[PDB]
Amino acid sequence: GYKTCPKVKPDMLNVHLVPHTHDDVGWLKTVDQYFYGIYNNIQPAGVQYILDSVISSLLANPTRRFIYVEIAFFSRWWRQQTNATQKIVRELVRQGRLEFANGGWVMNDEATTHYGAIIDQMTLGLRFLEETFGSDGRPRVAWHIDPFGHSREQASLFAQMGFDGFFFGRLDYQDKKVRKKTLQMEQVWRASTSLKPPTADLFTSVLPNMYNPPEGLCWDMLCADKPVVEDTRSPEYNAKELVRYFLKLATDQGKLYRTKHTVMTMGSDFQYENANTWFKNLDKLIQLVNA
Amino acid sequence: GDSAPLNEAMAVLQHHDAVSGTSRQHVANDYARQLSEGWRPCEVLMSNALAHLSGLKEDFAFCRKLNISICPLTQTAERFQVIVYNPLGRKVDWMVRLPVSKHVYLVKDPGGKIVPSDVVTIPSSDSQELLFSALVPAVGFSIYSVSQMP
Amino acid sequence: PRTQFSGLRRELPPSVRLLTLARWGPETLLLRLEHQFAVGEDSGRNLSSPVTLDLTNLFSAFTITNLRETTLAANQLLAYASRLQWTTDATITLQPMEIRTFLASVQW
Amino acid sequence: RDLVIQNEYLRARFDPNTGLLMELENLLLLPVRQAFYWYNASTGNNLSSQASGAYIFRPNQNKPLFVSHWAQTHLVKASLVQEVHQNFSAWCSQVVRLYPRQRHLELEWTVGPIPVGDGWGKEVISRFDTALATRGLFYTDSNGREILERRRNYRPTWKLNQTEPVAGNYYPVNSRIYITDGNMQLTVLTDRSQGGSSLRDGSLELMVHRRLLKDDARGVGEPLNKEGSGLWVRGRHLVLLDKKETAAARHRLQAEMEVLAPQVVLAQG
Amino acid sequence: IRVNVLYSTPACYLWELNKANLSWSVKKDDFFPYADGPYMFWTGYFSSRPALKRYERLSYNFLQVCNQLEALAGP
Numbered sequence: 001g002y003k004t005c006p007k008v009k010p011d012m013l014n015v016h017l018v019p020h021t022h023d024d025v026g027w028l029k030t031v032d033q034y035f036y037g038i039y040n041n042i043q044p045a046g047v048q049y050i051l052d053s054v055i056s057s058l059l060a061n062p063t064r065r066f067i068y069v070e071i072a073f074f075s076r077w078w079r080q081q082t083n084a085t086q087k088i089v090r091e092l093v094r095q096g097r098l099e100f101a102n103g104g105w106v107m108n109d110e111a112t113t114h115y116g117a118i119i120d121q122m123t124l125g126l127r128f129l130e131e132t133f134g135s136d137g138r139p140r141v142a143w144h145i146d147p148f149g150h151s152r153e154q155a156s157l158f159a160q161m162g163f164d165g166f167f168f169g170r171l172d173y174q175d176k177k178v179r180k181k182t183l184q185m186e187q188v189w190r191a192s193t194s195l196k197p198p199t200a201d202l203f204t205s206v207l208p209n210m211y212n213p214p215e216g217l218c219w220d221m222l223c224a225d226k227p228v229v230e231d232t233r234s235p236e237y238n239a240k241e242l243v244r245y246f247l248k249l250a251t252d253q254g255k256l257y258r259t260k261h262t263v264m265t266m267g268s269d270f271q272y273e274n275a276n277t278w279f280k281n282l283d284k285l286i287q288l289v290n291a
Numbered sequence: 292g293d294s295a296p297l298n299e300a301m302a303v304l305q306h307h308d309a310v311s312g313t314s315r316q317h318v319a320n321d322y323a324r325q326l327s328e329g330w331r332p333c334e335v336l337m338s339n340a341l342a343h344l345s346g347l348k349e350d351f352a353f354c355r356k357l358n359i360s361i362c363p364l365t366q367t368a369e370r371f372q373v374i375v376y377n378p379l380g381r382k383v384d385w386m387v388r389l390p391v392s393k394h395v396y397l398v399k400d401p402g403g404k405i406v407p408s409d410v411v412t413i414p415s416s417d418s419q420e421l422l423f424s425a426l427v428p429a430v431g432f433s434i435y436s437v438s439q440m441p
Numbered sequence: 442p443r444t445q446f447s448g449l450r451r452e453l454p455p456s457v458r459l460l461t462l463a464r465w466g467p468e469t470l471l472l473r474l475e476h477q478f479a480v481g482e483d484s485g486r487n488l489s490s491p492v493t494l495d496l497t498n499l500f501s502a503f504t505i506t507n508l509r510e511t512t513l514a515a516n517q518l519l520a521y522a523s524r525l526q527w528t529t530d531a532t533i534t535l536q537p538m539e540i541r542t543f544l545a546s547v548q549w
Numbered sequence: 550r551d552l553v554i555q556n557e558y559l560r561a562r563f564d565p566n567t568g569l570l571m572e573l574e575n576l577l578l579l580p581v582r583q584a585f586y587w588y589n590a591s592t593g594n595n596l597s598s599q600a601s602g603a604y605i606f607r608p609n610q611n612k613p614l615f616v617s618h619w620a621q622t623h624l625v626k627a628s629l630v631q632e633v634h635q636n637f638s639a640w641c642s643q644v645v646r647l648y649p650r651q652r653h654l655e656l657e658w659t660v661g662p663i664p665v666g667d668g669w670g671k672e673v674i675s676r677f678d679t680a681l682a683t684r685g686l687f688y689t690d691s692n693g694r695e696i697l698e699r700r701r702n703y704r705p706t707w708k709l710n711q712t713e714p715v716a717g718n719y720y721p722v723n724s725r726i727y728i729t730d731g732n733m734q735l736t737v738l739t740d741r742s743q744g745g746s747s748l749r750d751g752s753l754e755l756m757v758h759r760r761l762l763k764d765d766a767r768g769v770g771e772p773l774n775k776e777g778s779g780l781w782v783r784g785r786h787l788v789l790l791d792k793k794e795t796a797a798a799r800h801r802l803q804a805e806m807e808v809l810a811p812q813v814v815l816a817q818g
Numbered sequence: 819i820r821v822n823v824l825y826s827t828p829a830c831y832l833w834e835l836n837k838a839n840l841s842w843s844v845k846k847d848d849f850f851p852y853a854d855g856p857y858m859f860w861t862g863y864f865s866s867r868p869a870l871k872r873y874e875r876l877s878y879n880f881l882q883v884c885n886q887l888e889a890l891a892g893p
């Protein structure tokens with residue numbers, strides 16, 4: 001959990017790269033088509049491959065971290081694994097190389113859902129994690145990156161479930177504009193006019209670019225951004241310009257948030273199908289910039 | 292009898308592209324499909340539950356289309372029962388409305404005493420429904436008996 | 442042979458709601474009880490005031506043998522849980538809009 | 550002699566010239582009018598390519614049209630029920646009911662297959678109109694729990710520049726919505742989550758159904774069209790009238806009787 | 819200014835925000851209506867697909883009854 005967190009470098013601006021994959025439990029294809037990767041013509045997406053890769057990529061470099069959110073997809077994949085794999089993965093979670101973000105069976109909507117139904121849904125996901133990974137696989141923050149607006153009750157519900165924070169992508173465009181100008185991207189949300197504080201006080205953070213990589217740093221198999229090339233004798237060399245770009249990109253973003261810390265959501269809808277395209281380049285990225 | 296399948300489908304529908312109705316037509320069809328298939332194991336569970344709680348011997352049945360005035364049992368049987376379950380933590384005095392044939396029905400409550408009834412007609416469709424008050428205990432149920440007079 | 446049933450010995454007071462009654466396991470039920478009124482909705486009948494309830498015998502269908510407090514999603518033991526703090530510039534009692542979750546071992 | 554239906558707690562009147570609900574009362578009298586109107590869905594204009602769709606709601610006209618200015622009523626007064634059937638159109642009709650000892654008036658609406666043959670996407674609404682001064686404020690429930698106050702064209706958090714007067718004033722209503730002049734309250738309970746808002750004062754409205762023939766460019770890639778069995782839908786709306794100080798307890802308790810309703814199972818014998 | 823980039827999770831980023839011991843402003847209202855740009859509001863799905871919306875809120879009432887009965891009986 002928190003006792004597993006990485007080493008921040010005080011008195012410097014810190015950019016937390018958060019690799020992830022927004023897997024819609026149905027949208028343009030069905031749940032089984034998304035899990036298995038059927039009819040990739042409609043949409044290229046197969047979650048069973050995404051989970052396999054992530055794990056490999058995690059065993060490939062102990063520094064790497066990954067957060068997965070939709071329990072309905074994970075739950076399935078899991079029963080599909082061998083005792084060997086399950087023993088391994090449990091260790092990745094134990095030492096926090098694999099972390100769970102929302103914990104719900106799915107990432108529910110906030111405008112048309114019934115508070116009671118939202119709970120059954122959450123309890124169901126958190127239930128699986130609970131008895132599969134114990135305390136070690138319990139989410140600490142809530143992860144609504146795509147819902148279209150947010151209800152005060154949702155915040156109340158998460159607060160009452162023991163979540164410390166809640167991050168999201170979609171908010172009114174005018175609201176966002178003002179928030180970045182007023183350095184108010186993050187604050188505390190009092191979601192109840194009944195419950196006594198801190199009971200319904202959920203910390204809230206408005207992400208930078210919705211939930212997608214900064215323009216030019218998308219390395220999934222679905223993007224076509226130029227990959228990192230270090231060979232100094234090679235014409236495709238872009239390692240230098242790359243770092244020049246990043247640094248400017250980071251200090252620009254820092255100015256929008258109150259602490260020496262900012263997130264960078266590295267991933268989008270159904271990415272990491274081939275987890276390695278992402279991690280290989282990210283590894284170099286972290287090394288070249290901290291260098 | 293399994294409540295797991297329905298609890299799971301209700302979770303799925305909680306997605307942000309499901310109940311919000313923001314998914315494609317086929318995904319919207321498969322969503323309803325997962326729900327339909329969760330309703331069966333549950334009424335199986337509900338049958339065993341009741342049989343156990345009331346001892347009643349008859350095979351129960353469910354009327355999923357009350358929604359549009361359709362229920363084979365209440366529009367064909369001459370003698371049948373109505374088990375009304377109440378999930379609220381207090382008593383309910385709720386109105387029952389079942390589709391019947393063009394006859395007169397007599398309604399008896401849990402005790403056996405004749406309770407007020409009334410066959411109402413559905414305008415323009417010229418089909419009708421049997422009506423009566425059903426007093427149900429909190430977290431409980433009541434079983435009324437019905438018979439079409441000759 | 443059993444025309445009418447009820448699961449309670451004494452019904453819930455109007456300001457309370459049986460949120461969840463469920464089978465958590467073999468001899469374990471999941472129970473949630475919320476206070477359906479928010480501060481101000483007293484409507485002249487002190488319906489928004491706190492309420493205290495006894496859980497021993499509330500239910501007749503079964504008997505509660507063990508009880509254990511929980512967080513809303515039932516994945517942590519409320520007494521063993523905690524959240525980060527933030528500076529901004531039996532008998533269970535319920536306050537307006539409070540939902541309490543319990544895992545109780547039972548016997549039928 | 551006007552068209553009337555009653556029971557112990559309430560009495561509803563219908564306008565002789567129209568067949569529409571004209572007056573509701575507690576045996577608090579309240580002149581309320583109800584009717585179905587539709588919004589001519591937008592496919593875009595010089596102001597923006599945007600079009601109404603599965604996600605987005607954009608009327609190319611801020612003023613809805615009457616699905617019909619009057620309704621053909623058929624009185625049915627039974628020993629156990631009192632209902633006024635209303636026929637507004639081939640794809641729109643409603644039944645207004647009052648059952649034994651029930652504190653609310655039941656409005657069961659059926660918005661049949663919306664005619665899109667005119668080539669115009671439509672978004673239907675049931676709108677209640679009254680004179681009770683609400684000052685642009687109205688209330689909505691958040692996922693069926695606490696209630697948040699809403700103001701026409703206003704934002705608690707910033708200084709809003711309204712771009713759509715109708716659209717930017719719609720909020721999710723999952724169980725209820727209400728408008729009070731501080732003295733008497735009119736509340737509406739739903740059987741499913743819907744959209745709604747108080748566009749003109751003393752008025753209210755929920756969205757029953759919508760059918761658009763043009764995608765709204767957000768991902769789905771298909772117009773909320775061809776829903777099949779869903780083309781034809783039927784739902785209920787529970788109208789509640791009481792003084793502001795007594796309203797709360799009633800909508801809370803009935804709202805719960807609405808979601809955790811009784812289940813019926815039959816057995817032959 | 820200096821920059822340090824690293825792998826991280828939303829939870830660790832939150833731990834650092836806490837460690838800073840700051841004082842944050844308070845939010846007391848919902849985030850509706852959502853609008854990603856002028857003339858376009860995501861307020862139409864509040865009613866999109868009435869049938870399904872009702873089918874689900876009904877399955878809820880049903881699952882509940884199902885749950886309560888499984889609890890009262892002791893198989």
Ligand SMILES: *[C@H]1O[C@H](CO)[C@@H](O[C@@H]2O[C@H](CO)[C@@H](O[C@@H]3O[C@H](CO[C@H]4O[C@H](CO[C@H]5O[C@H](CO)[C@@H](O)[C@H](O)[C@@H]5O[C@H]5O[C@H](CO)[C@@H](O)[C@H](O)[C@@H]5O)[C@@H](O)[C@H](O[C@H]5O[C@H](CO)[C@@H](O)[C@H](O)[C@@H]5O)[C@@H]4O)[C@@H](O)[C@H](O[C@H]4O[C@H](CO)[C@@H](O)[C@H](O)[C@@H]4O[C@H]4O[C@H](CO)[C@@H](O)[C@H](O)[C@@H]4O)[C@@H]3O)[C@H](O)[C@H]2NC(C)=O)[C@H](O)[C@H]1NC(C)=O
Pocket residue numbers: 029030316317318320321323324327328331355358776777778779781782783784868869870872873876
């Ligand atoms: C009042 O209240 C109502 C709620 O109570 C409310 O909602 C309606 O509720 C009713 C029930 O209460 C709902 O009815 C059920 O609906 C289910 C869903 O039906 C739709 O989806 C089916 C499957 O769709 C997939 O597969 C099709 C082919 O197989 C494709 O054509 C689809 O495109 C879709 O494909 C996708 O998914 C596939 C995986 O599933 C995937 O491989 C593929 O690639 C792709 O991704 C369809 O079959 C079904 O179509 C039928 O009906 C339409 C009408 O629109 C016709 O055009 C079709 O020709 C066809 O007849 C729909 O698209 C149903 O599955 C469910 O059926 C079962 O139950 C009913 C009774 O409840 C039985 O009569 C029936 O026999 C079924 O039982 C079968 O299955 C069971 C277990 O499920 C089994 O035990 C038994 O043997 C049997 O085989 C039922 O009909 C209804 O959906 C709700 N409507 C809405 C709009 O939500 C209603 O609105 C309210 N009324 C008012 C107010 O007006």
Ligand SMILES: *[C@@H]1O[C@H](CO)[C@@H](O[C@@H]2O[C@H](CO)[C@@H](O)[C@H](O)[C@H]2NC(C)=O)[C@H](O)[C@H]1NC(C)=O
Pocket residue numbers: 415635636637638639642
């Ligand atoms: C409401 O009244 C209308 C009359 O316009 C009914 O619709 C007509 O019904 C007749 C016979 O049922 C059809 O031949 C017409 O074509 C219908 N009108 C149309 C579609 O143009 C309608 O059935 C009534 N609705 C009710 C009371 O449910």
Ligand SMILES: *[C@@H]1O[C@H](CO)[C@@H](O[C@@H]2O[C@H](CO)[C@@H](O)[C@H](O)[C@H]2NC(C)=O)[C@H](O)[C@H]1NC(C)=O
Pocket residue numbers: 710711712856
């Ligand atoms: C209210 O919204 C409108 C549109 O978003 C703003 O006016 C537009 O501003 C752009 C450039 O900023 C112009 O090119 C358009 O011509 C304007 N639209 C029209 C037709 O007037 C407006 O600025 C907003 N309100 C304010 C002043 O903040």
Ligand SMILES: *[C@@H]1O[C@H](CO)[C@@H](O[C@H]2O[C@H](CO)[C@@H](O)[C@H](O)[C@H]2NC(C)=O)[C@H](O)[C@H]1NC(C)=O
Pocket residue numbers: 589609610668669
């Ligand atoms: C509803 O919208 C339609 C579509 O804009 C209005 O008619 C329009 O569509 C016609 C073809 O379908 C165009 O040829 C017309 O130019 C256009 N009308 C206008 C705005 O000039 C229609 O009038 C609207 N319906 C009502 C009665 O409000």
Ligand SMILES: *[C@@H]1O[C@H](CO)[C@@H](O)[C@H](O)[C@H]1NC(C)=O
Pocket residue numbers: 083
């Ligand atoms: C893990 O796999 C082994 C086969 O090697 C199996 O016997 C064992 O039961 C599995 N885990 C369990 C259920 O203990």
Ligand SMILES: [Zn+2]
Pocket residue numbers: 022024146307
């Ligand atoms: Zn999504």
